[PDB]
């Protein structure tokens, strides 16, 4: 708010003894503003309690390694069909994830051709989902340049841009991203894992140089992909295994019988 | 006002500090405009480099002796050793410093070698030069083409040679000699004048 809002008055308290509250009041006469309360957060025309300041903290620091951790986790989550489906993507007619497309799609220059390729590879039902999802935003945010809302479509990741970025620019919901610069705002929109990612072959083959492997060092300086604290992530087979089940005592009833 | 087992703080906020709060909202905007200024400056004078050649100098003080960094300009003696006048040097991308001198040979030799390396890659155009030759050149980054390079620390294998006096004893004796130099010299002067004045 303005630094002087509510404080452009010469108001002075009347003091006690005049049967009115001790709030400051406008002086003078001849206008209806005269004698009216001022300066108070409870007063009409006063300044708000604790007026908002610009030196509030707006940007937040995140450790670079943790940010990379989360980016890798989101990329990994993009290959889990259950996560992509819970994420809301119409991916039921894609035969396997990750969806990798040939490099000719890096060279499409017309939106018609890019849409045709999206239709061919089975990624256009999610574009149709974006098209059908357009609604007027609820609330005053529509007065602030945010008039419509819609879903997110597929994310197309390339290695070389020979026209694909501009060809997909106008398709609603589709985002394009270089494999060299992938971030969490695209990989996990809304902090929800499982983005529907369409890789070109070049981007898929560059992933291993970008993030490294057990045989390849990452281009990122001193960076290694994270290690899990658990090796077998399926604990039902760990519990119901020969090694563990051979040393346990026999199980009781799932529910104790009531004896009294 | 003072309560609990807490550190005692020094929060200097008793003046009208809120009238002098500079929040750098324009960090990204200034970064972008700074880059645009840099492109305009480069494109104006291409293929001439945007950076003048800078010398390499030791950083001062006992804390930064080990480090070596870019200086401000080459000394008059250094330019003299490569046969360049300072007035001329300023016009071919070489920086001059009339204030710095060369007490020692090491920095002087490093900067003479640096000037000779830059001078070998220099190509000065003239009227007879056509735009075909000028377009055959790319605008290099002098700060990267002639970087400031730290001398490598000594490492590897060498023969062990053990002096009889330990290093700790050497340091202690140096400290003691410095501490008592003045009083010992005064004592010796008094002794000499006494034993050579009455011995007249």
């Amino acid at each position: 708010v303005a630094e002087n809002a509510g404080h452009q008055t010469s108001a002075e308290s009347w003091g006690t003894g005049r049967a009115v509250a001790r709030i400051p009041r406008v002086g003078g006469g001849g206008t209806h503003r005269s004698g009216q309360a001022a300066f108070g957060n409870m007063c009409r025309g006063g300044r708000m309690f604790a007026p908002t300041k610009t030196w509030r903290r707006w940007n937040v620091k995140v450790n670079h390694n943790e940010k990379r951790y989360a980016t890798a986790s989101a990329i990994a989550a993009s290959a889990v069909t259950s996560l992509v489906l819970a994420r809301g993507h119409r991916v039921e007619q894609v035969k396997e994830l990750p969806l990798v497309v040939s490099n000719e799609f890096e060279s499409v220059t017309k939106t018609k051709d890019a849409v045709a390729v999206l239709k061919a590879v089975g990624a256009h039902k999610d574009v149709v989902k974006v098209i059908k999802s357009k609604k007027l935003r609820a609330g005053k945010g529509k007065l602030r340049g945010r008039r419509f809302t819609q879903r997110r479509g597929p994310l197309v990741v390339y290695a070389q841009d020979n026209g694909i970025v501009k060809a997909l620019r106008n398709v609603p919901g589709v985002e394009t991203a270089s494999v060299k610069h992938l971030g969490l705002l695209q990989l996990a929109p809304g902090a929800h894992l499982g983005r529907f990612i369409i890789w070109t072959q070049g981007a898929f083959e560059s992933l291993d140089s970008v993030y490294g492997s057990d045989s390849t060092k990452s281009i990122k300086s001193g960076y290694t992909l994270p290690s899990n604290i658990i090796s077998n992530t399926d604990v039902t087979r760990l519990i119901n295994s020969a090694e563990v089940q051979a040393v346990v005592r026999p199980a009781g009833e799932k529910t104790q019988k009531k004896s009294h | 006002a003072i309560s609990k087992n807490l550190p005692l703080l020094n929060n200097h906020f008793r003046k009208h500090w809120q009238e002098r709060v500079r929040v750098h909202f324009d960090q990204a905007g200034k970064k972008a405009s700074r880059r645009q200024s840099r492109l305009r400056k480069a494109a104006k004078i291409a293929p001439r480099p945007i950076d003048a050649l800078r010398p390499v100098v030791r950083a001062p003080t006992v804390k930064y002796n080990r480090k070596v960094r870019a200086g401000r300009g080459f000394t008059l003696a250094e330019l003299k050793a490569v046969g360049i006048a300072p007035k001329y040097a300023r016009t071919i991308g070489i920086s001059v410093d009339h204030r710095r001198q060369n007490k020692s040979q090491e920095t002087f030799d490093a900067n003479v070698a640096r000037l000779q390396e830059y001078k070998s890659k220099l190509v000065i155009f003239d009227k007879k030069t056509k735009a075909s030759e000028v377009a055959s050149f790319e605008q290099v980054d002098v700060s990267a083409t002639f970087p400031v390079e730290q001398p490598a620390p000594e490492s590897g294998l060498r023969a062990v040679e053990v002096p009889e006096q330990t290093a700790y004893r050497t340091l202690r004796l140096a400290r003691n000699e410095k501490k008592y130099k003045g009083i010992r010299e005064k004592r010796a002067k008094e002794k000499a004048e006494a034993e050579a004045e009455k011995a007249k």
Binding site: L143, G145, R147, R169, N170 | -
Partner: protein, 126 residues
């Protein structure tokens, strides 16, 4: 999406530029599409509506009506067609105001400036 830094996506700025548009600016805003016959005759798809054009109403309660434009009433952002009248219980008739984007031009009023405008826009006039 817009790319130029000189283009504004502000709703308030766009509406202010519309309702405070000068009369000269309102001429372009009150453009009308040509009919299919004139579009192939002149190879131009829309023109600023002019006083003596003939239009066909394609939207609203007067859809299907035809007539000659009587006035481009630029202050009200409307055109008044020849016989598109509403009859008050008084017995008097007031013209019905129609936006030019809700009609098609079926016959152009031509002069030396209209022809140059059509030829400027890549079309063919005479």
């Amino acid at each position: 999406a817009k790319i130029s830094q000189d283009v504004s996506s502000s709703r308030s700025k766009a509406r202010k530029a519309y309702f405070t548009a000068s009369s000269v600016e309102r001429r372009v805003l009150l453009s009308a599409p040509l009919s299919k016959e004139l579009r192939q005759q002149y190879n131009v798809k829309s023109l600023p509506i002019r006083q003596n054009d003939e239009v066909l109403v394609v939207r609203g309660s007067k859809k299907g009506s035809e007539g000659k434009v009587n006035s481009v009433y630029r202050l009200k952002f409307a055109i008044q067609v020849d016989k598109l009248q509403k009859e008050k219980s008084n017995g008097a008739s007031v013209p019905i105001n129609i936006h030019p984007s809700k009609v098609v031009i079926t016959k152009l009023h031509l002069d030396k400036d209209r022809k140059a405008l059509i030829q400027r826009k890549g079309g063919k006039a005479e």
